[PDB]
Write a protein that binds this DNA or RNA. Structure first.
Lengths: 234, 149
RNA sequence: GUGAACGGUGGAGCAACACCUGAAGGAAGGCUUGAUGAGCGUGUUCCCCGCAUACGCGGGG
């Protein structure tokens, strides 16, 4: 269907996971249903859901951005945007002279069509490592290429099934090249880290017409980009 | 040409808190307005709309016809005095966009050209008649023209 | 074999003549196509959810 993208301009850049932790710390004392909505927690406990999370943080040059997938995620972002903006306004009016928080909002539709020619898509800061078995797959390129193939195809199928639209099942993807390999730490000052890929390029015969999220740690702000900017790039 | 005009939301382009110190309250009032705009956008008219308006392209030549039903020469002189300083006014237009500006390339008085760059040349008896009629022009005729029985 | 039997309502005639729907009246006052999405930090085994039924697979941060 359609997804929603809300940008919060603050005047200074804060990272997606840091903004996630900041709105977790700030709105915690009051309104527990709303933070249970935005961090996609279980209705009874603090543990997040194992399914596809509808609302995820993203990257903004002057602040942070929020993505609500589908009608439910769009409604959650719609009921949560003024409370988040008021919390940011009070937090940054408590200290200093005080800044003005600007907003932006977009409703990007989702579409996909199969074409008989390959198409190029570059994904920045995608997490692909979670276990030791994937590390054993990563050492050899032949058994790692098929792993990236299946990961990209399953991420596309999971997002298409989560948003509620049908995807053709004859898609042939291919993975060409990589630029860098780095690490991602969920919590600062922790020994544990997950391997991640920087500037991967992929080739799929079909075309995409919106924000598409691939890989792991999608909620934290990893492995997503707009295909609308990348088709006809400029 | 369809000419496109858009209205920007002013406080969507602040940038700094030095621009908001004249707004009473400061950042809090602009943030409340932003919250109201957000509540409008999720669901009362807003601002910064995008619109278009078809206009006639400039630089083309027009024609105007002003006919008279057996006029006195003071009336013809009145119309020519309007045509002399017609260039200060605007034809219809959007006042903000400075539309309707025009020069008069000519005035034909029953077929003969009486217009030059320095206003109207010729038709002297109409000008003397309207100069005679402007003198002695009292309010009394206007009063018993507008007076309703 | 009807107090029956028989019996044309007919002929002709102009609804027509003349009549102004008209006078007056501003589509306008205000409004950046300009952005937004394009590049920027983490270095190794820690919780929890299903299919199983543990030989392992997928997966939340």
């Amino acid at each position: 269907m359609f997804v929603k993208q809300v940008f919060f301009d603050l005047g200074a850049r804060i990272h997606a996971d840091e903004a996630r932790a900041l709105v977790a710390k700030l709105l915690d004392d009051t309104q527990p249903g709303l933070v249970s909505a935005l961090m996609n927690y279980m209705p009874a406990s603090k543990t997040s859901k194992t399914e596809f999370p509808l609302v995820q943080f993203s990257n903004f040059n002057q602040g942070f951005a929020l993505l609500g997938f589908g009608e439910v995620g769009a409604q959650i972002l719609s009921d949560a945007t003024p409370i988040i903006h008021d919390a940011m306004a009070k937090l940054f009016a408590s200290r200093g002279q005080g800044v003005v928080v600007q907003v932006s909002s977009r409703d990007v539709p989702l579409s996909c069509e199969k074409r008989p020619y390959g198409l190029q898509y570059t994904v920045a800061k995608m997490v692909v490592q979670k276990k030791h078995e994937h590390r054993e797959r990563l050492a050899n390129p032949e058994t790692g290429k098929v792993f990236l193939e299946g990961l990209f195809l399953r991420s596309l199928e999971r997002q298409a099934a989560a948003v509620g639209m049908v995807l053709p099942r004859d898609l042939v993807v291919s993975f060409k090249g990589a630029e860098r390999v780095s690490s991602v730490k969920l919590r600062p000052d922790s020994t544990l880290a997950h391997g991640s890929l920087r500037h991967a390029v992929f080739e799929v015969n079909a075309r995409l017409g919106g924000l598409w999220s691939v890989g792991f740690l999608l909620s934290k702000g990893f492995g997503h980009i707009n295909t609308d900017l990348q088709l006809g790039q400029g | 040409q369809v000419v496109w005009a858009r209205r920007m939301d002013p406080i969507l382009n602040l940038g700094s808190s030095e621009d908001v110190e004249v707004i009473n309250g400061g950042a809090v009032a602009a943030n409340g307005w932003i919250q109201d705009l957000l509540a409008n956008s999720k669901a009362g008219r807003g601002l910064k709309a995008f619109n278009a308006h078809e206009v006639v392209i400039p630089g083309l030549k027009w024609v105007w016809r002003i006919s008279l039903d057996r006029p006195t020469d003071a009336q013809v002189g009145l119309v020519l005095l309007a045509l002399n300083k017609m260039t200060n006014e605007r034809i219809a237009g959007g006042h903000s966009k400075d539309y309707g500006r025009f020069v008069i390339d000519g005035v034909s008085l029953n077929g003969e050209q009486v217009w030059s760059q320095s206003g109207i040349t010729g038709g002297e008896q109409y000008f003397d008649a309207v100069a005679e009629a402007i003198d002695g022009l009292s309010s009394k005729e206007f009063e018993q023209f507008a007076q309703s029985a």
